[PDB]
Copies of this chain bind each other. A is one copy, B any other.
Amino acid sequence: ATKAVAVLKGDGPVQGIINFEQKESNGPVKVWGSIKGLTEGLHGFHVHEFGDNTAGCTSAGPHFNPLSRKHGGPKDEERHVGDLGNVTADKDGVADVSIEDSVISLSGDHSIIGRTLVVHEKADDLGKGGNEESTETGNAGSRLACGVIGIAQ
């Protein structure tokens, strides 16, 4: 598709809306929106594999990683397709998202449509942490809110 949307819900006060836009298949996807209820600071922002939220966010699985790479920042080469990095929430706990990614897409093999967008408790270290977790989850912590990425108009 060329436009997708995800409504982030969770158990806590964390909630938000993230829009995805892709002008043309080969093109980079613009991810933009707002999330409220976050502690100020950095928070992991990733696209997990399954858009299954039967057990809330835990059922979403691990990072969408079809090229079986290790975890890293969104500008890194070795990285999961879903590693979108961190989003910063201000003093009022609001994160006005604005990422532009070229690895994820809204069509094809790397299509995130049907998968789960997840916002994390802590910062993602982008794989520069030094331990096994770093190159697997980036040590981002628990999943505060998540939502299935769907086709929008």
Residues on A facing B (Cβ under 8 Å): 1, 4-5, 7, 17, 49-54, 61, 113-116, 147-153
Q: A4-B51, A5-B51, A114-B149 are in contact. List 7 more A-B contacts (CB 8 A).
A: A5-B52, A5-B54, A50-B150, A50-B153, A51-B148, A51-B152, A114-B114
A150 and B61 in contact (CB under 8 A), knowing A114-B1, A114-B4, A114-B114? no
Report the Cα distance A146→B19, complex, angstroms: 19
- Contact: A153 with B61, CB < 8 Å? yes
Chain A's interface: helix, strand, loop or mixed, by majority?
Answer: loop
Distance in Å: Cβ of A17 to nearest Cβ of chain B:
6
- Contact: A51 with B151, CB < 8 Å? yes
List the 10 closest pairs (A to B, CB-CB), nearest first: A51-B150, A148-B150, A52-B152, A113-B114, A148-B148, A114-B151, A7-B53, A51-B151, A114-B150, A114-B114
